[PDB]
Amino acid sequence: HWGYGKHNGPEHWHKDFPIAKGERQSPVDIDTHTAKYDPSLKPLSVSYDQATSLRILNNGHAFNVEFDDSQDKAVLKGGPLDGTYRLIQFHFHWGSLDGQGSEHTVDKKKYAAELHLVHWNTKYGDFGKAVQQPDGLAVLGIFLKVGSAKPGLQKVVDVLDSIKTKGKSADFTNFDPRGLLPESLDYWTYPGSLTTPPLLECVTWIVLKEPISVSSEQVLKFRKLNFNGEGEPEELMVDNWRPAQPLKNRQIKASF
Numbered sequence: 424h425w426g427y428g429k430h431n432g433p434e435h436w437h438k439d440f441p442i443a444k445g446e447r448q449s450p451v452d453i454d455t456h457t458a459k460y461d462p463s464l465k466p467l468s469v470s471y472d473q474a475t476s477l478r479i480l481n482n483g484h485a486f487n488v489e490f491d492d493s494q495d496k497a498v499l500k501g502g503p504l505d506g507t508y509r510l511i512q513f514h515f516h517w518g519s520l521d522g523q524g525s526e527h528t529v530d531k532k533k534y535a536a537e538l539h540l541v542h543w544n545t546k547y548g549d550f551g552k553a554v555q556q557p558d559g560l561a562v563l564g565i566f567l568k569v570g571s572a573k574p575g576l577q578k579v580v581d582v583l584d585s586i587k588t589k590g591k592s593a594d595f596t597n598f599d600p601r602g603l604l605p606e607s608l609d610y611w612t613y614p615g616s617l618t619t620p621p622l623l624e625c626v627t628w629i630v631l632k633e634p635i636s637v638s639s640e641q642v643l644k645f646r647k648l649n650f651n652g653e654g655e656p657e658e659l660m661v662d663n664w665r666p667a668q669p670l671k672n673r674q675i676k677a678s679f
């Protein structure tokens with residue numbers, strides 16, 4: 424199946440998932456000078472005070488911190504969105520080196536990693552039905568640069584030992600996602616897709632202008648994870664990012 428290796432990586436995905444060459448694929452390069460300020464964009468509304476994390480999972484491509492999305496406990500609204508989107512999970516994409524790792528790029532600049540807080544439009548009933556809709560998902564992207572440590576991320580870093588290989592999971596309750604946010608909520612927004620197969624074009628991307636900083640130690644831990652399952656040859660989980668795709672007939676809007 425698909426992955427990020429030289430033989431099953433992004434350049435191969437189109438064979439099993441032809442939408443890979445679609446009209447609204449993600450990620451994309453964010454040309455800051457070409458993005459247009461849209462004064463009609465409402466302020467983003469992040470309501471995570473009632474968030475309920477349940478567990479963390481190594482799925483073989485990245486690791487997901489899942490939340491209870493059976494109720495409106497942690498929602499995203501406002502901004503370019505119409506309606507209420509529930510947070511279902513967040514994960515990251517990172518590189519083998521600090522100079523790479525993010526999926527989106529800013530004026531071609533690559534960050535060491537990128538956080539994706541995934542939400543689905545409640546009007547669609549569940550995540551599965553939502554990914555089948557043009558406005559089914561809202562993914563909040565947050566760039567990570569290496570510098571000072573991000574205190575709110577350490578709980579995540581310290582649990583990675585428990586889910587080193589594909590398929591492992593561990594309880595991860597009472598984790599507060601608000602600790603992963605930058606001070607500013609200024610953002611860029613554009614219509615796109617999931618950045619991994621099936622690459623469905625069901626995402627409204629909201630990428631924050633301000634990156635958060637994490638320490639070299641924190642990111643190093645990410646790089647000790649495995650793509651493989653226990654008892655299989657060790658393949659470090661690194662560079663699990665898709666490169667920038669053609670913007671085509673789309674325009675990136677800025678909230679600032």
Ligand SMILES: NS(=O)(=O)c1ccc(C(=O)N2CCC(c3ccccc3)CC2)cc1
Nearest residue numbers: 539541550551554562616617618619620621
């Ligand atoms: N990187 S990202 O764009 O943020 C992103 C976000 C979420 C997922 C994700 O969970 N998968 C697995 C489940 C699959 C699916 C679920 C239900 C019905 C059909 C398909 C969609 C993709 C992948 C990439």
Ligand SMILES: [Zn+2]
Nearest residue numbers: 514516539618
């Ligand atoms: Zn992602």
